[PDB]
């Protein structure tokens, strides 16, 4: 990695210079080209979940990693996502997830968008939660405060902080 | 990479 790149990523993340270098070394070992593809990205999820189909979910995640939307995950995009998810504040992690779930990038997560997300998660992996639809109904019942079938960032952030298991999950 | 997984899929 070049020094100006190194300095820039340190300045933009919760990592030190040495930590950024160590991550680069790890990133290049797993992805020698330095330009991670959809398939490459999917293997991360097949671990953790080797008994479902992570194709759909892996795509949604690949798109929020792909900050410049050029079709590849380069290191700077990888390290920045990683900064948020491993060391972000709860608010920051929730912003990033909001961005993951807001498929059309308006300022709203519709029930349908959330449905696509939860269904993809189910395909990747209790009676009350045994279908995506039940999970989504539970989410909107807790978080959609004005009952318009859409979650704003605030609704999402506050709704997620209200639930102790979400707080626990994002520790 | 476990943190990526948790932050991504937590809403389920
Ligand atoms: Ca990219
Ligand atoms: Ca939307
Ligand atoms: Ca609403």
Residue numbers in the entry:
A (entry chain B): 8 to 132, 139 to 184
B (entry chain C): 6 to 17
What does the paper say about this structure?
Determination of the crystal structure of the complex of Ca2+/NCS-1 with the GRK1 peptide revealed a different mode of recognition compared with D2R. Only one molecule of the GRK1 peptide is bound, deep into the hydrophobic groove of NCS-1. The GRK1 peptide binds as a two-turn α-helix involving residues Ser-5–Ala-14, with the peptide aligned parallel with the N-C axis of NCS-1; electron density for the remainder of the peptide was not observed. The protein-peptide interface is formed by 29 residues from the protein and 8 hydrophobic residues from GRK1 peptide, with total buried surface areas of 711 Å2 for NCS-1 and 921 Å2 for the peptide. The electron densities for Gln-54–Gly-59 and part of the EF3/EF4 linker region are missing. The main protein-peptide contacts are formed by residues Leu-6, Val-9, Val-10, Ala-14, Phe-15, Ile-16, and Ala-17 of GRK1 peptide. These residues fit into the hydrophobic crevice, with side-chain hydrophobic contacts formed between them and the exposed highly conserved hydrophobic residues of NCS-1 from both the N-lobe, C-lobe, and C-terminal helix 10. In contrast, the C-terminal region of NCS-1 in the NCS-1·GRK1 peptide complex forms an α-helix that lies to one side of the hydrophobic crevice. The electron densities for Asn-134–Glu-137 of the EF3/EF4 linker region are missing, making the C-lobe site very solvent-exposed and allowing the GRK1 peptide to bind deep into the hydrophobic pocket. In both the NCS-1·GRK1 peptide and KChIP1·Kv4.3 complexes, hydrophobic side-chain interactions are found between the C-terminal region and the bound peptide, indicating that that region helps to stabilize the binding of the partner peptides.
